[PDB]
Ligand binder design. Structure first.
Ligand SMILES: *C(=O)COCCOCCNC(=O)COCCOCCNC(=O)CC[C@H](NC(=O)CCCCCCCCCCCCCCCCC(=O)O)C(=O)O
Ligand SMILES: *C(=O)COCCOCCNC(=O)COCCOCCNC(=O)CC[C@H](NC(=O)CCCCCCCCCCCCCCCCC(=O)O)C(=O)O
Ligand SMILES: *C(=O)COCCOCCNC(=O)COCCOCCNC(=O)CC[C@H](NC(=O)CCCCCCCCCCCCCCCCC(=O)O)C(=O)O
Lengths: 28, 21, 28, 21, 28, 21
């Protein structure tokens, strides 16, 4: 499903989208 | 770290899901 | 008004919404 | 810290407003 | 073009908008 | 740092572009 490296802000965008209304913690 | 897995390598949804609240 | 704990990204979303065009600083 | 007030406890709008520019 | 100081979250919003689909790294 | 250039001073688009991936 993921076919890209997720660097810098891209990883934060991914977590935002994946986690939805749950929210997330980052980078720890 | 998640930065490592997902920027250096390719990570899966499940790996990302581990960081959700 | 606030009836939820605001953890991880949720606190950043809250500050984004509360502070509007002023912007904000976080976590310090 | 603001993380503490607002994740461990429940914080108010005014407490959040203190972090606006 | 830029006529404002970009402090706190404003700098992150600017980078988000400027960098588009490239994404960005911050603050380093 | 970019924080310095752009909060203390006024920075240009090109200065911001240096931080894009
Ligand atoms: C290091 O800490 C040593 O390890 C032992 C002690 O620490 C343990 C972990 N640290 C803790 O503080 C305790 O955590 C316990 C678990 O809590 C639950 C998870 N939360 C955290 O871990 C909190 C950590 C915290 N912050 C983060 O991780 C979150 C940072 C996320 C930033 C990016 C979010 C961006 C959100 C974007 C929203 C913008 C909306 C735009 C809308 C426009 C839409 C439109 O106009 O249409 C931390 O400080 O580290
Ligand atoms: C520690 O520093 C020691 O203490 C003494 C010295 O430091 C004092 C404080 N630190 C300073 O650097 C000086 O600050 C002075 C006060 O300045 C004003 C406030 N600014 C700061 O404090 C700057 C600190 C800085 N950064 C932050 O705090 C801000 C970080 C915010 C990240 C999260 C923002 C997310 C924004 C999301 C936007 C996404 C848009 C999406 C749109 C899509 C919409 C659609 O498609 O529809 C720092 O580096 O710490
Ligand atoms: C210090 O590190 C010592 O220096 C030597 C070693 O380190 C070198 C640099 N650090 C590295 O880790 C290696 O970097 C190599 C270069 O990699 C490429 C660039 N990436 C990084 O540098 C990664 C650093 C990383 N993270 C960041 O910089 C990025 C943090 C950005 C946070 C803010 C992004 C907010 C995104 C908002 C999206 C919200 C969407 C809302 C949508 C709603 C829309 C609607 O509803 O309509 C790090 O951990 O530092």
């Amino acid at each position: 499903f993921v076919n890209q490296h997720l660097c810098g802000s891209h990883l934060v965008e991914a977590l935002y989208l994946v986690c939805g209304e749950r929210g997330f913690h980052y980078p720890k | 770290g998640i930065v490592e897995q997902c920027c250096t390598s390719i990570c899966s949804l499940e790996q990302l899901e581990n960081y959700c609240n």
